[PDB]
Amino acid sequence: ASHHLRMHFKTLPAGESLGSLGLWVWGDVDQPSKDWPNGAITMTKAKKDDYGYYLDVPLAAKHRQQVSYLINNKAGENLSKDQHISLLTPKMNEVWIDENYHAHAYRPLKEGYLRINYHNQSGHYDNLAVWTFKDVKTPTTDWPNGLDLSHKGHYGAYVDVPLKEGANEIGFLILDKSKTGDAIKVQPKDYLFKELDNHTQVFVKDTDPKVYNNPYYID
Numbered sequence: 001a002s003h004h005l006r007m008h009f010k011t012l013p014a015g016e017s018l019g020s021l022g023l024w025v026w027g028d029v030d031q032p033s034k035d036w037p038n039g040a041i042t043m044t045k046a047k048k049d050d051y052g053y054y055l056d057v058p059l060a061a062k063h064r065q066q067v068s069y070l071i072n073n074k075a076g077e078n079l080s081k082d083q084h085i086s087l088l089t090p091k092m093n094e095v096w097i098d099e100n101y102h103a104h105a106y107r108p109l110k111e112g113y114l115r116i117n118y119h120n121q122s123g124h125y126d127n128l129a130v131w132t133f134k135d136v137k138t139p140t141t142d143w144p145n146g147l148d149l150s151h152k153g154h155y156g157a158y159v160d161v162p163l164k165e166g167a168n169e170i171g172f173l174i175l176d177k178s179k180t181g182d183a184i185k186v187q188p189k190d191y192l193f194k195e196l197d198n199h200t201q202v203f204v205k206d207t208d209p210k211v212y213n214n215p216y217y218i219d
Contacts, residue, residue, distance in 0.1 A: 024070050129175045129177055131143070132147065
């Protein structure tokens with residue numbers, strides 16, 4: 001198939017061997033599972049990585065909106081319960097499934113931090129910085145010397161920002177320290193984010209004033 005969903009699992013069912021575990025899929029997949037239970041994708045095909053295990057599921061050639069799945073075993077038990085993933089866009093190629101089978105469109109990070117990812121067209125991040133305020137642990141000082149965007153990730157440059165105990169809302173702005181006066185602000189409107197319980201990354205780009213909760217920039 002032309003499109004795949006790379007499924008990252010944090011923890012597979014306790015005490016079960018990969019040789020007895022299956023990934024049983026339906027919805028907008030290329031080849032829905034048939035013949036219960038042995039028609040599942042054998043999880044022997046999964047590979048170990050840092051997060052856990054991952055397994056690539058071929059997706060439908062057209063109309064990629066939702067994938068459903070469960071983890072079974074060769075005795076025919078539904079070990080996970082049925083689960084469902086909304087594809088934010090038909091190009092969504094990667095998901096992270098935590099130990100409670102909650103799905104994420106990026107790798108969830110450590111609690112009490114927000115990663116701010118910033119992407120631009122040129123890929124030039126030298127002397128760009130992040131100004132932070134509201135419920136961060138330590139707001140930036142000495143305008144315009146904010147947090148460097150020296151770390152490079154999958155979704156542009158980034159910085160990991162510690163949040164205050166009980167944080168509800170963060171504000172930030174992307175700065176260009178090579179400039180002077182009003183041009184230091186890459187764009188003029190403050191970014192505001194207040195969904196900290198669901199989300200440990202956010203995504204901003206170019207001169208777009210919106211904060212996105214996913215790397216596909218879907219509002």
